[PDB]
Design a protein around this ligand. Sequence first.
Ligand SMILES: [Mn+2]
Ligand SMILES: [Mn+2]
Ligand SMILES: [Mn+2]
Ligand SMILES: [Mn+2]
Lengths: 354, 354
Amino acid sequence: MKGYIQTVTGPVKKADMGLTLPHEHLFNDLSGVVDEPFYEFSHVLVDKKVSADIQWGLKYDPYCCCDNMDKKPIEDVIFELNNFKELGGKTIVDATGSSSIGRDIRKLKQVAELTGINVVASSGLYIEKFEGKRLADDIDAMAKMIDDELNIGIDGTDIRAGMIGEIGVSPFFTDGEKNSLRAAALAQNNNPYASMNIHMPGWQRRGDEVLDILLTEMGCDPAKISLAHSDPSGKDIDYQCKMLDRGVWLEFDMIGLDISFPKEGAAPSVMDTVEAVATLIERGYGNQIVLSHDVFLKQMWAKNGGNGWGFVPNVFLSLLAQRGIDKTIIDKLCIDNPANLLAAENLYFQSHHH
Amino acid sequence: MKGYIQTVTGPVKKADMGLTLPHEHLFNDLSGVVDEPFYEFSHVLVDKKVSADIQWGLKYDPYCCCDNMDKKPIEDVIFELNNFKELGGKTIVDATGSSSIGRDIRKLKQVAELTGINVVASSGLYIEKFEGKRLADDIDAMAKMIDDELNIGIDGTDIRAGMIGEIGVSPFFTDGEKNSLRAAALAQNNNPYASMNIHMPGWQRRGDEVLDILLTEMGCDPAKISLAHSDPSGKDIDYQCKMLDRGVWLEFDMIGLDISFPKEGAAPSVMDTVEAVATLIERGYGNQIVLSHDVFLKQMWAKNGGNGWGFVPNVFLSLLAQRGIDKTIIDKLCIDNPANLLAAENLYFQSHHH
Ligand SMILES: [Mn+2]
Ligand SMILES: [Mn+2]
Ligand SMILES: [Mn+2]
Ligand SMILES: [Mn+2]
């Protein structure tokens, strides 16, 4: 009851969230993991500024380009956000939950004030590759940190997070990552409105072991848990329905990503995901799906020839409609659904303790 | 023997062609078939100038945008060509073979002179949708026209074509289109160095009936025939090998196209085509494959965030190398192969008659 989201400028009631994107990165910095150029052509990308003129290459080796991986200028973030705003965009979640990946709580507040968009910050440790020993801390300590960031503030400020995540599960699902997941669960069970977004290794099928921890062991409310990067398992209907049957949300947050990673594999096409999401809706699971773009690289901005933050509510929703999905469901996918995931009260834990 | 290509500034010997793109459009104009906006979002595209900022939409409804479909400014063509030149690009084929689709023989010559790139013009009637009654002419008359454009010149000039094509076979393969194919065959059999490029309905499997006409009926040299738009049949190995076994070239000319057409279907991904082409090479057919981009819309230019004319020799070739194809074959795919298709002498017809 009384569902709401804690934004960077205060609480917003569930009914007031409107068109919402539940998994994006407004301010992140991946500067400490620029990769060496992977291919013979990649060397020319390395020191170049991201623009439309190098999409040809960035779509095959995004991580070799320093600029692509560097901090995001506020001017550029606001320009791209004004795109979403023009379509009736009202709320956006920054899933940059850790200093490991450049969370910038003060710029998030700045952008909310300038644009009037509801901006939700996150708290959560990422994969061991970025976090190192931070995942080896006591689970209670890690949980306390997340609890403080949700209820008191971040980085010495009074600006609070509204989501737990994105919690890092790597393709190696390390013992530290498992510890991190347990800490996130403890924090969630102390915070009646907080959803938990899990970064999944999308080209793997690790959902059952993740949910054995969150659901079976830690006793979390499945309706407050979302599995990120579900997109690359979209052809695997049996796996996806198995997860949905455990009561969690599947998040297709790579819509319009349009990049091939030299290691981890190539992102599904928009049409691939249209078919997956449409088939899940036909199977009765429309009320358990959320959609986003996971903008996390400068190449993804529309001003650079990427798809930006308008693509899901404008293009993808139109594609679903052409595929014959009913308008009533389509209208829920980017409004009611993310509002319920992010803001509905937990059914198992309705008190916040000290 | 003595293989060569007739370019817009004169003959170039086969050995001097270098890095060659055998299927592109430098100057074309599709202004008379702008489609109505297909989707709810498409209306904003209609009157906008193509830029990186509307790729989001043009990738799903390219033909509704008037600017995208209009004539190509020479400044823009030269900028994009200088990209290819920088990679050692030496020769490019404009497959705009008809006034129906805006062939501009004088601008082709202009660009060759300004850039030093060997530019090959084409002669050939397109699909009935564009050509109408022009396909209902006497086959001998149609053949004479193609013969004159190869040997005397185009549009009152002394600038000649060097390729027959792209010959229009629509998804309806009309009687007119069949007539057009026969005229192209007659012209080829009178022109010992001219290759014939057939626009195929790529999401269909019409190759056997096309080749029954060209090969069985008209007696053409299969080694001078290329089937365009083979890309969307790349998963259909049995069909593709059946065509290759008849001795013709398969052209994968949609590499880096990255567009979904609302009717005809979505283009294969670059990685899809990497796998198809690699598997054909592993099957022994590497000497029967050519590669191109089919740049035909302003959205495809690199300056707009498309992949431009550098993508095949830079990115695709690197991808094939990562997939473990041998360098000796990779070096042939964009040099020896297109030179042989375009410039080798016909084995069946070695005299030009009047
Ligand atoms: Mn993630
Ligand atoms: Mn993310
Ligand atoms: Mn064509
Ligand atoms: Mn073409």
